[PDB]
Design an enzyme around this catalytic site. Structure first.
Site, PDB file in Angstrom:
ATOM      1  N   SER A  38      -5.786   3.270   4.021  1.00  0.00           N
ATOM      2  CA  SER A  38      -5.235   2.347   3.044  1.00  0.00           C
ATOM      3  C   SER A  38      -6.345   1.664   2.223  1.00  0.00           C
ATOM      4  O   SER A  38      -6.214   0.523   1.804  1.00  0.00           O
ATOM      5  CB  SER A  38      -4.334   1.324   3.743  1.00  0.00           C
ATOM      6  N   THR A  67       1.771   3.353   5.222  1.00  0.00           N
ATOM      7  CA  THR A  67       2.122   1.945   5.418  1.00  0.00           C
ATOM      8  C   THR A  67       1.868   1.083   4.192  1.00  0.00           C
ATOM      9  O   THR A  67       1.180   1.479   3.266  1.00  0.00           O
ATOM     10  CB  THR A  67       1.291   1.355   6.560  1.00  0.00           C
ATOM     11  N   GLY A  68       2.450  -0.119   4.203  1.00  0.00           N
ATOM     12  CA  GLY A  68       2.143  -1.169   3.253  1.00  0.00           C
ATOM     13  C   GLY A  68       2.298  -2.518   3.938  1.00  0.00           C
ATOM     14  O   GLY A  68       3.246  -2.719   4.702  1.00  0.00           O
ATOM     15  N   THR A  69       1.376  -3.429   3.655  1.00  0.00           N
ATOM     16  CA  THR A  69       1.395  -4.778   4.225  1.00  0.00           C
ATOM     17  C   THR A  69       0.935  -5.746   3.160  1.00  0.00           C
ATOM     18  O   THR A  69       0.041  -5.442   2.411  1.00  0.00           O
ATOM     19  CB  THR A  69       0.469  -4.883   5.437  1.00  0.00           C
ATOM     20  N   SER A 125       0.775  -1.227   0.000  1.00  0.00           N
ATOM     21  CA  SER A 125       0.000   0.000   0.000  1.00  0.00           C
ATOM     22  C   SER A 125       0.819   1.297   0.000  1.00  0.00           C
ATOM     23  O   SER A 125       0.241   2.375  -0.057  1.00  0.00           O
ATOM     24  CB  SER A 125      -0.970   0.064   1.182  1.00  0.00           C
ATOM     25  N   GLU A 153      -5.268  -3.415  -6.612  1.00  0.00           N
ATOM     26  CA  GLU A 153      -5.523  -4.042  -5.323  1.00  0.00           C
ATOM     27  C   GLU A 153      -6.587  -5.119  -5.481  1.00  0.00           C
ATOM     28  O   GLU A 153      -7.538  -4.948  -6.251  1.00  0.00           O
ATOM     29  CB  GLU A 153      -6.017  -3.000  -4.331  1.00  0.00           C
TER      30      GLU A 153
END
Ligand code: NA
Length: 267
Positions: free
Chosen positions: A102, A211-213, A44, A142
């Site tokens: 996100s 953030t990114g996950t 993200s 996504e």
């Protein structure tokens, strides 16, 4: 004699992870670089430059354009968009949700705004090319962009590249200052990163982040931090735990600790 790279390596071993770090050099400070030219999935983190691309491409009045969509457009996780299927959401609202929650549907809608239904990921990549980034690439929307196997170059960036992108967007002149202020504000009010770079920096530092996950234990955070005296730094921290398989647990605390090491040498 100490070495920060050895400490990053210790963190890797302790978390059974691969860690990437980039903090651009400044007039007063050396760069911090650890696996900075290795590829890591965006996850993200791309939503921040995505919003920049949309800002860049359009007059600010475009923020008021109403985007409509149906329940069939919802992609997990979309904390905002899935509550507004009847109302639609403005472009500005979508930027807000994409950064602060996100929101995946918001991100896909923004990609569509940028490059149409077939062209959004290509348009996004082209925006990065326009900033001098010849390595990063977005291929999927996504949520598939989070799921590429380790080694696959699709949907990847490097800590060096994303840091220099964020540097240009937030601190540099990639955006005019009005649009820059909007991007900055959304990142500043992010609801997702309290346990990542924010957690490694003392309370008297300002931290704005995205953030990114993802799969394979992917946990990233990209931030701009300001010292208590107003001195800014860009901090990009990327990680994965690919050795653990596609469902390896992402580790926020690894990013927090990496950020602590960074703060320790920037303080
Ligand atoms: Na609708």
């Amino acid at each position: 004699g100490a070495d920060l790279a050895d400490r990053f390596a210790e963190l890797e071993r302790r978390y059974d992870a691969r860690l990437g770090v980039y903090v651009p050099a400044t007039g007063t400070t050396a760069a911090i670089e650890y696996r900075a030219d290795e590829r890591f999935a965006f996850c993200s983190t791309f939503k921040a430059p995505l919003v920049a691309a949309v800002l860049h491409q359009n007059p600010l009045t475009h923020l008021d354009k109403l985007i409509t969509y149906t329940s069939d457009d919802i992609r997990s996780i979309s904390p905002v968009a899935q509550q507004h299927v009847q109302t639609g959401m403005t472009i500005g609202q979508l930027c807000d949700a994409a950064i602060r929650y996100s929101d995946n549907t918001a991100a896909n809608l923004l990609l569509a705004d940028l490059g149409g239904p077939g062209g959004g990921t290509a348009a996004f990549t082209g925006y990065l090319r326009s900033l001098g980034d010849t390595v990063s690439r977005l291929d999927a929307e996504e949520p598939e962009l989070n799921r590429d196997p380790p080694g696959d170059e699709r949907d990847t960036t490097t800590p060096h590249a994303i840091a220099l992108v964020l540097q240009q967007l937030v601190l540099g002149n990639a955006l005019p200052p009005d649009k820059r202020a909007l991007l900055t504000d959304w990142m500043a009010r992010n609801t997702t990163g309290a346990k990542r770079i924010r957690a490694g920096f003392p309370a008297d530092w300002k931290v704005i982040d995205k953030t990114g996950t993802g799969d394979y234990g992917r946990a990233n955070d990209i931030a701009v931090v300001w010292s208590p005296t107003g001195v800014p730094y860009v901090v990009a921290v990327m990680s994965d735990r690919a050795g653990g398989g596609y469902d390896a647990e992402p580790r926020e605390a690894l990013l927090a600790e990496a950020a602590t090491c960074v703060a320790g040498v920037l303080a």
